[PDB]
Amino acid sequence: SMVNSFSGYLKLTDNVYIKNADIVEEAKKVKPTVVVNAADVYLKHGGGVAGALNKATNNAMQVESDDYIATNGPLKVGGSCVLSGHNLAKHCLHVVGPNVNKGEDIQLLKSAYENFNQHEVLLAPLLSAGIFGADPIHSLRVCVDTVRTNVYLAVFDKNLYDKLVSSFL
Numbered sequence: 132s133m134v135n136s137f138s139g140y141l142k143l144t145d146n147v148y149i150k151n152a153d154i155v156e157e158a159k160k161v162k163p164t165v166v167v168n169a170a171d172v173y174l175k176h177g178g179g180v181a182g183a184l185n186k187a188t189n190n191a192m193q194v195e196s197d198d199y200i201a202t203n204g205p206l207k208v209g210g211s212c213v214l215s216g217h218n219l220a221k222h223c224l225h226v227v228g229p230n231v232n233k234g235e236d237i238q239l240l241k242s243a244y245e246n247f248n249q250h251e252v253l254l255a256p257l258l259s260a261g262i263f264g265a266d267p268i269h270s271l272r273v274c275v276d277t278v279r280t281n282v283y284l285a286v287f288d289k290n291l292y293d294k295l296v297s298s299f300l
């Protein structure tokens with residue numbers, strides 16, 4: 132059931148682990164079965180996790196995503212799709228957290244994290260915690276209280292990581 136080479140993760144719960152790391156570098160090191168992208172409904176991979184993952188695939192993720200949207204239309208807020216992980220992972224699970232900065236319901240963050248339960252092991256970011264404007268501690272708490280499968284969270288920002296791991300969740 133895949134034993135992966137995740138290294139240097141702090142344990143949060145039975146099934147959630149966390150590390151101060153760039154998700155791109157973790158994916159290159161581990162080559163997991165599933166890397167999660169913090170996507171938008173249009174799969175336009177501009178910045179943050181999505182832009183960094185896409186750049187590391189030499190834009191192949193974006194080209195594949197454009198074909199996905201042309202065939203299927205936008206994802207739902209809280210929804211997901213499974214696409215290739217290209218050189219980074221077997222699969223990329225593109226998951227859309229709510230864009231709280233655009234008035235989308237923060238409750239949809241739970242629906243977003245539920246997608247993780249369809250996969251035994253994931254390398255993932257904190258959904259909605261960047262430009263989508265959700266409180267990062269809240270995103271972590273929802274993750275812990277929603278995901279039952281094994282999730283390795285990569286937190287790029289050191290100061291944020293230090294705050295998250297010293298917080299009650």
Ligand SMILES: Nc1ncnc2c1ncn2[C@@H]1O[C@H](COP(=O)(O)OP(=O)(O)OC[C@H]2O[C@H](O)[C@H](O)[C@@H]2O)[C@@H](O)[C@H]1O
Binds near residue numbers: 169178179182256265
């Ligand atoms: N390379 C990285 N590795 C790990 N964590 C990262 C990295 N880059 C950012 N983070 C953290 O990952 C967390 C999420 O930040 P975000 O990636 O903005 O995702 P969202 O769900 O809020 O916004 C999605 C939009 O952003 C994109 O443009 C998409 O195309 C969408 O339009 C934050 O804590 C970041 O510090």
